[PDB]
Design an enzyme around this catalytic site. Sequence first.
Site, PDB file in Angstrom:
ATOM      1  N   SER A  54     -25.410  19.070 -40.781  1.00 15.98           N
ATOM      2  CA  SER A  54     -26.083  18.355 -39.699  1.00 15.98           C
ATOM      3  C   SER A  54     -26.622  17.022 -40.208  1.00 15.98           C
ATOM      4  O   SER A  54     -27.062  16.898 -41.357  1.00 15.98           O
ATOM      5  CB  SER A  54     -27.207  19.197 -39.083  1.00 15.98           C
ATOM      6  OG  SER A  54     -28.338  19.301 -39.910  1.00 15.98           O
TER       7      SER A  54
ATOM      8  N   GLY B 107     -25.534  22.945 -43.465  1.00 17.02           N
ATOM      9  CA  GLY B 107     -26.045  21.898 -44.320  1.00 17.02           C
ATOM     10  C   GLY B 107     -25.480  20.520 -44.053  1.00 17.02           C
ATOM     11  O   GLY B 107     -25.827  19.569 -44.778  1.00 17.02           O
TER      12      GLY B 107
ATOM     13  N   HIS C 299     -33.997  19.002 -36.076  1.00 20.26           N
ATOM     14  CA  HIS C 299     -34.164  20.376 -36.559  1.00 20.26           C
ATOM     15  C   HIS C 299     -34.144  20.472 -38.080  1.00 20.26           C
ATOM     16  O   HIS C 299     -34.526  21.514 -38.639  1.00 20.26           O
ATOM     17  CB  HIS C 299     -33.119  21.298 -35.931  1.00 20.26           C
ATOM     18  CG  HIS C 299     -31.739  21.232 -36.534  1.00 20.26           C
ATOM     19  ND1 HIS C 299     -30.739  20.471 -35.981  1.00 20.26           N
ATOM     20  CD2 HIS C 299     -31.174  21.914 -37.559  1.00 20.26           C
ATOM     21  CE1 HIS C 299     -29.614  20.661 -36.652  1.00 20.26           C
ATOM     22  NE2 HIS C 299     -29.853  21.527 -37.628  1.00 20.26           N
TER      23      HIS C 299
ATOM     24  N   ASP D  59     -32.245  16.054 -30.428  1.00 15.87           N
ATOM     25  CA  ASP D  59     -32.216  16.585 -31.794  1.00 15.87           C
ATOM     26  C   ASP D  59     -32.002  15.458 -32.803  1.00 15.87           C
ATOM     27  O   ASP D  59     -31.243  15.603 -33.764  1.00 15.87           O
ATOM     28  CB  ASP D  59     -31.132  17.648 -31.984  1.00 15.87           C
ATOM     29  CG  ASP D  59     -31.345  18.482 -33.258  1.00 15.87           C
ATOM     30  OD1 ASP D  59     -32.464  18.388 -33.840  1.00 15.87           O
ATOM     31  OD2 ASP D  59     -30.391  19.207 -33.679  1.00 15.87           O
TER      32      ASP D  59
END
Length: 197
Positions: free
Chosen positions: A157, A155, A75, A99
């Site tokens: 991830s 911020g 993502h 993801d």
Amino acid sequence: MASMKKKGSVVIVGRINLSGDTAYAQQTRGEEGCQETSQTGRDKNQVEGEVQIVSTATQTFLATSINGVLWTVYHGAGTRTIASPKGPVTQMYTNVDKDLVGWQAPQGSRSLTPCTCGSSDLYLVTRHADVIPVRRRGDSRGSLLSPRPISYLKGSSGGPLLCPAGHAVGIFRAAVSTRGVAKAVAFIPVESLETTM
Ligand SMILES: [Zn+2]
């Protein structure tokens, strides 16, 4: 078809320094250099460490080297290349269902070792070099020992969850929040990375 644009590369813009006694963020590239590197895909900056701060034209997040692969979240990166000294480098792993994406780890990076401790006492490393204790609660979930607004985790991830010995237990994917407060985190377990490989 002549006027169709290409999406830029992910760019390393800094790192989270975990070498010494104090964790701290370091910036290695400013916005203008980041924008140019994203367009050319050519990044000649020396890379160091395990946790990189990365950016596209529109987002910033983290990427973590484990077992010779620089891993991050789909993502954040989508299917983008990453900038390198010799030009854009294509993803070697892409899994939208997890993801998860990954590229070959950059020259000079250091890789975390996958954890085989079986410990549930974890530590989340954020883009602001906060080291947040997390109790593992499942295969892909951990609770924050001290909840805090989701703003503090935005911020981060692609950052690591680490065991007490500093091994990689997972990649931070999503925050579980109530009334804007992060009480738990979701992560890609290192075993799922190891299977993907
Ligand atoms: Zn361990």
